[PDB]
Amino acid sequence: VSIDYRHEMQDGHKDRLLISHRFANGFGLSSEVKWAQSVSNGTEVVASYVYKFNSVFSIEPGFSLESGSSNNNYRPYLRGRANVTDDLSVALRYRPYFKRKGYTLTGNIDYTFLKDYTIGYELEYKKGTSYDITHNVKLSYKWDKNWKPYVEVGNVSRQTRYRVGVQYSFH
């Protein structure tokens, strides 16, 4: 089980607390409380299964619902992942959204170095139906077996988005 707090700012601010767990059988579940000001709030829940074909490739179908003051939306997904080495993995996710319509396509490259550091590149395309492009860089550090602080800097277009957070892992 892990508890992840994150603070986000652009250019008011957003906060989240994400609680999740991945079972050894590949089933996973998470719940996220979110709050923001420029005031708003919301709750997202996610269920998924990682099916691994082997040590290189896996697929992850997912289901999510969000309920909040601003909006609600349903966002199922399918993430493929390829571990090209022990230290290097790539993934691609298709995630439609239906909100009170469109999809995102998200590519990730994650590289672990010096045991405890991971640098991630993320490229995300969002297209509505009735483009935005994100370039995001994440650096995280496994401080000890329980704590992993991290920072991310991304562009959205023009505007810069900053995140700092920490993940707590239970043992």
Ligand SMILES: O=C(O)[C@H]1O[C@H](O[C@@H]2[C@H](O)[C@@H](O)[C@@H](O[C@@H]3[C@H](O)[C@@H](O)[C@@H](O[C@@H]4[C@H](O)[C@@H](O)[C@@H](O[C@@H]5[C@H](O)[C@@H](O)[C@@H](O)O[C@@H]5C(=O)O)O[C@@H]4C(=O)O)O[C@@H]3C(=O)O)O[C@@H]2C(=O)O)[C@H](O)[C@@H](O)[C@H]1O
């Ligand atoms: O229209 C709206 O409702 C909003 O649109 C905007 O939001 C963006 C984005 O478009 C949303 O999809 C969303 O992002 C997702 C999460 O909320 C966010 O914390 C983050 O997720 C991480 C991780 O990057 C992601 O890959 C995934 O992790 C999987 C899996 O779910 C986990 O269980 C675990 O197995 O690890 C996996 C992994 O590492 O890949 O979920 C993570 C998590 O924290 O749960 O990205 C998600 C995503 O990209 O889909 O919110 C964004 C936001 O900025 O809020 C817009 O910004 C907003 O204003 C609304 O209008």
Ligand SMILES: CCCCCCCCOCCOCCOCCOCCO
């Ligand atoms: C393998 C499945 C393990 C699931 C364990 C987590 C379930 C523990 O119960 C928590 C339920 O909490 C309900 C909170 O109430 C909020 C109201 O909305 C809930 C609608 O589902």
Ligand SMILES: CCCCCCCCOCCOCCOCCOCCO
């Ligand atoms: C055989 C294993 C399958 C692995 C699953 C990978 C995830 C599925 O990807 C779906 C591809 O959808 C791409 C849609 O692209 C639309 C056009 O691109 C956006 C430009 O406007």
Ligand SMILES: CCCCCCCC
């Ligand atoms: C297992 C910890 C995640 C909490 C999920 C709650 C689902 C309603």
Ligand SMILES: CCCCCCCC
């Ligand atoms: C009670 C929240 C969980 C709903 C999604 C679970 C689908 C398996």
Ligand SMILES: CCCCCCCC
């Ligand atoms: C609603 C279950 C998830 C479906 C995943 C395939 C479409 C993204």
Ligand SMILES: CCCCCCCC
């Ligand atoms: C401020 C860090 C949030 C996670 C800590 C979990 C407390 C048991």
